[PDB]
Design an enzyme around this catalytic site. Structure first.
Site, short mmCIF file in Angstrom:
data_model
loop_
_atom_site.label_atom_id
_atom_site.label_comp_id
_atom_site.label_asym_id
_atom_site.label_seq_id
_atom_site.Cartn_x
_atom_site.Cartn_y
_atom_site.Cartn_z
N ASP A 22 -11.18 -13.88 -22.89
CA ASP A 22 -11.16 -12.44 -22.80
C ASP A 22 -11.02 -12.09 -21.36
O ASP A 22 -11.13 -12.95 -20.49
CB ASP A 22 -12.44 -11.86 -23.37
CG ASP A 22 -12.52 -10.36 -23.23
OD1 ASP A 22 -13.57 -9.83 -22.79
OD2 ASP A 22 -11.53 -9.69 -23.56
N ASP A 27 -17.39 -11.85 -23.87
CA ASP A 27 -18.66 -11.28 -23.44
C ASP A 27 -19.07 -10.05 -24.26
O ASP A 27 -20.26 -9.81 -24.49
CB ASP A 27 -18.55 -10.84 -21.97
CG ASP A 27 -17.67 -9.58 -21.77
OD1 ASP A 27 -16.42 -9.60 -22.09
OD2 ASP A 27 -18.18 -8.51 -21.28
N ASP A 54 -15.42 -9.21 -28.93
CA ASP A 54 -15.05 -10.65 -28.89
C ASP A 54 -15.72 -11.43 -30.02
O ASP A 54 -15.26 -12.51 -30.42
CB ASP A 54 -15.49 -11.29 -27.58
CG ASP A 54 -14.76 -10.74 -26.37
OD1 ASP A 54 -13.51 -10.45 -26.47
OD2 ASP A 54 -15.39 -10.57 -25.27
F1 BEF Z 1 -10.66 -8.05 -22.05
BE1 BEF Z 1 -11.59 -8.10 -23.27
F2 BEF Z 1 -10.86 -7.67 -24.27
F3 BEF Z 1 -12.64 -7.38 -22.94
MG LIG Z 2 -14.41 -8.05 -22.76
#
Ligand code: BEF
Ligand SMILES: [Mg+2]
Length: 994
Positions: free
Chosen positions: A351, A703, A707
């Protein structure tokens, strides 16, 4: 009231029939609590202490073994007083081991949840509401909040529930929704209805979502939903609704159930050959009321001589070992199997906002005017190191550390940053880190000022708490802040009006310090500052300034730029109306440009290097974020997922662009593209699923709440130590340290554990083959039993025990990483290793009844029996005259079996040294490359002498100490197995691919 965002404020108030001024009456609360339940997620943390054990035993092999135990149970039950002094011990042994693993594993699960409970619920959740109860706001448990409630939120508050904004008390309201949306820069809200009923969270600008926090401002609103009906609620259920199918390595073991369950049939075939031999002779001295007690007895005899009964423990041990090692790096592995599993991963999906990036706004670039001379204008450009709010980093010019205080321009720049600022920085002594106070884009200025230290204030002997505002405090003493003209959306700038403070500079007068979007602020500047003096703003000067702003606003940098200026001769307070922000822009005119600062949500330090290591390991890295594409790509370039100037035409997609693709293209796109932005939580799950459809072991790193579903679907979920509680519960591993490179270390270890794992399976099972080859040679062919059950058990279990775990310390090659991840479907044991342990397997046979029976036939102190009077030993207590010997009991003597067991053991010690390398000769890969293995052999061997001396033992294990003449025969029978394999390997390296 879902859909509250599409409805107006009055509509939402009417819907719940509540007064905006007093809030719900204590009667309405009682009713709403009744109709909607409390505000809260359905108490999580499933799978009880009992649930765990339940699924623990639900392993194919533990089951096989346990079933074995039921069958063997009736065998040890059908045994007469001949060797049943410990023959019935067996079941207790097996069963004990069973509970022995159930206990350990279950221990780890609970343990895990503990490290995973790192301050996360340590802080009580409160909510501020206005209820008819009283006039003043009330601070209650967030769980006691109900839809319709009137809630109040302010800077720093954690939004208690999904709320419909009613009235904004500050000029503007700012919310950091990153924990849910992955939105890099805080969102400014409004109170008007958002028509499109299909508006996603990023579009609901009149809503506050539970779990998010207020970046700036104050506001009053009405709760729309609570519990599982909230955005975070929906996700928890969505996530829970996703299935965890099975485990990547567990699947390998589930797969070994083949090689053994199959022997179930194999033994049936060997057995079928003698059964028919009796449906020919007319005997009626015991049908299905008497005669048959031998047929079912050997089935478990060889059974247990089939199941390498160490391995389930050995696996737990080595695996757990890997766990600990990971932990030395702050690798909390909530599950033992994934330990190795992260190794098999071919792809790592990570992410953005909060995982690949630190999530804290930081100033890193800035510039002031150097000199102006006609059409010539040069700038003094600096860069700033550090990627968090901590006051740690340096200011550089041309890559070299400088003292900002020696540049008069920077002194004023730092001054504007410190004064034109409604936020600050703080040190959370509890979490042990620095945190923003108010707006991130303002705190960034705060820490910039602490790094610049333009007055060279003393800061070496300060505490973390004091260090956070030292330099800023110094500047706050130079001017009195009279008032501030808050940020407005039309003007896109903010300013503060200051009067001279210390009498040190009273001949200065009043000043106005301004900051804002470059274009508008620069257009309102009639002057440019150069050091301490000022020159008029000219086309050539404006051009240079705007061109560098442009560069920094795109390309390699793509930073958020802020222009800083000051009004040298500001109006008198009297001639200024401060109640309407529509007048502020005009007060912020005739300004003197001072400089520009460039900032952004920084990548974590170790990410770039990490992505490069994965590349060399053949592991792809894909960014999947909810943030806008511009930022997504920019960060991809900074960390190396994309080239600095690479064109990402079809290698970067938005949520929509992705959906506009036919399923087939989508699938293909996951294999080609590395950046998916403005995607929803199901998008992430979807992408992972596509990857997995190509039989790729995928990992996910996150995080935030968004996610959670992807983290769960991935074979290995990796959650940031500073991430949300959801994300963590949905992961197999947690980076307590937020060190992204630990992932690579985990892959590396997950790899070493593995190889050495298929190893102790080789060497271990070796025995079972050699083991039944003997039972078969003596049952359907001749000679007495050369070894018995409660003889071979101590062997497989302890004799071969320490060496296995020993393989856990097996030294991994120095090239274990610099090579691609192994096949998803690759078997494990086969081809040239089946034969490798089959050949060796069947050798020990000719070594047991061979070197052992040898005692029976040629052993200077053994009978001297003939070959077939040994293969017919059964007909001793009847057709005795045919072979008139001495005592029909010598056939059940311990000496032969001891001779056989000692051969099994010695041979396994040697094969332990062999199984060191699959195809490398013991000359090339010496046996001393693994010191633990050498010691384990010593331990196992001395444990053999123990079972042959300590009176109690030799009594219960049907054996008898051999002679030096007999041992020497054992050696001559065993040792050559090394020659056999040392030869089969050679054939594999030279005349084969090995
Ligand atoms: F970049 Be993640 F989608 F928070
Ligand atoms: Mg994120």
């Amino acid at each position: 009231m879902e859909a509250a965002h599409s409805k107006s404020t009055e509509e939402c108030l009417a819907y719940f029939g509540v007064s905006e001024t007093t809030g719900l009456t204590p009667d309405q609360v009682k009713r709403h609590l009744e109709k909607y339940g409390h505000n809260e997620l359905p108490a999580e943390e499933g799978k009880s202490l009992w649930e765990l054990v339940i699924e623990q035993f639900e392993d194919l092999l533990v089951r096989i073994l346990l079933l074995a135990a039921c069958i063997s149970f009736v065998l040890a039950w059908f045994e007469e007083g001949e060797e049943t002094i410990t023959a019935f011990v067996e079941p207790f042994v097996i069963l004990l081991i069973l509970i022995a693993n159930a206990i350990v594993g279950v221990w780890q699960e609970r343990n895990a949840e503990n490290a995973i409970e790192a301050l996360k619920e340590y802080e009580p959740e409160m909510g501020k509401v206005y209820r008819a109860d009283r006039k003043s706001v009330q601070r209650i448990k967030a769980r006691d909040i109900v839809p319709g409630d009137i809630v109040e939120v302010a800077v720093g508050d954690k939004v208690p529930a999904d709320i419909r904004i009613l009235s904004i008390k500050s000029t503007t309201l700012r919310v950091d929704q990153s924990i849910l949306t992955g939105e890099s820069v805080s969102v400014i809200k409004h109170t008007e209805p958002v028509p499109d009923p299909r508006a996603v969270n990023q579009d609901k600008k009149n809503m506050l979502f539970s779990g998010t926090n207020i970046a700036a401002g104050k506001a009053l609103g009405i709760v729309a939903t609570t519990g599982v009906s909230t955005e975070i609620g929906k996700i928890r259920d969505q996530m829970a609704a996703t299935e965890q199918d099975k485990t990547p390595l567990q699947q390998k073991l589930d797969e070994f159930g083949e090689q053994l369950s199959k022997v179930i049939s194999l033994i049936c075939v060997a057995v079928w050959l003698i059964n028919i031999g009796h449906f020919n002779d007319p005997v009626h001295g015991g049908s299905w009321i008497r005669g048959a007690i031998y047929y079912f007895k050997i089935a478990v005899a060889l059974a247990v001589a089939a199941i390498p009964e160490g391995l389930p423990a050995v696996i737990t041990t080595c695996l757990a070992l890997g766990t600990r090692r990971m932990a030395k790096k702050n690798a909390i592995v909530r599950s033992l199997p994934s330990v190795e599993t992260l190794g098999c991963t071919s792809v790592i999906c990570s992410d953005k906002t909060g995982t690949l990036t630190t999530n804290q706004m930081s100033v890193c670039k800035m510039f002031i005017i150097d000199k102006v001379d006609g059409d010539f204008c040069s700038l003094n450009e600096f860069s700033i190191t550090g990627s968090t709010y901590a006051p740690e980093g340096e200011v550089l010019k041309n890559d070299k550390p400088i003292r900002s205080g020696q540049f008069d321009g920077l002194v004023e720049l730092a001054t504007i940053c410190a004064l034109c600022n409604d936020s600050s920085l703080d040190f959370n002594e509890t979490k042990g880190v620095y945190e923003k106070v108010g707006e991130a884009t303002e705190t960034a200025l705060t820490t910039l000022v602490e790094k610049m230290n333009v007055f060279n204030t003393e800061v070496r002997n300060l505490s973390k708490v004091e260090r956070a505002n030292a330099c800023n405090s110094v500047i706050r003493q130079l001017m009195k802040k009279e008032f501030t003209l808050e940020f407005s959306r039309d003007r896109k700038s903010m300013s503060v009006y200051c009067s001279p403070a210390k009498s040190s500079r009273a001949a200065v007068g009043n000043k106005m310090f301004v900051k804002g979007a470059p274009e508008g602020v620069i257009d309102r500047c009639n002057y440019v500052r150069v050091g301490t003096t000022r020159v008029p703003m000219t086309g050539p000067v404006k051009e240079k300034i705007l061109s560098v702003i442009k560069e920094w606003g795109t390309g390699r940098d793509t930073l958020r730029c802020l222009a800083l200026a000051t009004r040298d001769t500001p109006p008198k307070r009297e001639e200024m109306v401060l109640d309407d922000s529509s007048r502020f822009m005009e007060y912020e005119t005739d300004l003197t440009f001072v400089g520009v600062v460039g900032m952004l949500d920084p990548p974590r330090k170790e990410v770039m290097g990490s992505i490069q290591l994965c590349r060399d390991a053949g592991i792809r890295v894909i960014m999947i974020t909810g943030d806008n594409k511009g930022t997504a790509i920019a960060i991809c370039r900074r960390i190396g997922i994309f080239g600095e100037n690479e064109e990402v035409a079809d290698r970067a997609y938005t949520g929509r662009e992705f959906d506009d693709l036919p399923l087939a293209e989508q699938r293909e796109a996951c294999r080609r593209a590395c950046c998916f932005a403005r995607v929803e939580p199901s998008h992430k799950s979807k992408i992972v699923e596509y990857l997995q459809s190509y039989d790729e072991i995928t990992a996910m790193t996150g995080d935030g709440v968004n996610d959670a579903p992807a983290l769960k679907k991935a074979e290995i979920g990796i959650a940031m130590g500073s991430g949300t509680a959801v994300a963590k519960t949905a992961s197999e591993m947690v980076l307590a340290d937020d060190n992204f490179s630990t992932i690579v270390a985990a892959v590396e270890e997950g790899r070493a554990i593995y190889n050495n794992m298929k190893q102790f399976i080789r060497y271990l099972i070796s025995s079972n083959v050699g083991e039944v080859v003997c039972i078969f040679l003596t049952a359907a062919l001749g000679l007495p039993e050369a070894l018995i059950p409660v003889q071979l058990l101590w062997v497989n279990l302890v004799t071969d025990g320490l060496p296995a775990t020993a393989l856990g310390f097996n030294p991994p090659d120095l090239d274990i990483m610099d090579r691609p991840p192994r096949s998803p479907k690759e078997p494990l044991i086969s081809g040239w290793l089946f034969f490798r342990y089959m050949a060796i397997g069947g050798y020990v046979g000719a070594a047991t009844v061979g070197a052992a029976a040898w005692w029976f036939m040629y052993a200077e102190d053994g009978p001297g029996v003939t070959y077939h009077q040994l293969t017919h030993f059964m007909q001793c207590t009847e057709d005795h005259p045919h072979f008139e010997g001495l005592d029909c009991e010598i056939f059940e003597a311990p000496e032969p079996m001891t001779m056989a067991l000692s051969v099994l053991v010695t041979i396994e010690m040697c094969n332990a040294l062999n199984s060191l390398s699959e195809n490398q000769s013991l000359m090339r890969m010496p046996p001393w490359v693994n010191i633990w293995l050498l010691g384990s052999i010593c331990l196992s061997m001395s444990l053999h002498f123990l079972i042959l001396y300590v009176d109690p033992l030799p009594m219960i294990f049907k054996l008898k100490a051999l002679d030096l003449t007999q041992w020497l025969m054992v050696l001559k029978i065993s040792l050559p197995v090394i020659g056999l394999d040392e030869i089969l390997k050679f054939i594999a390296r030279n005349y084969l691919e090995g």
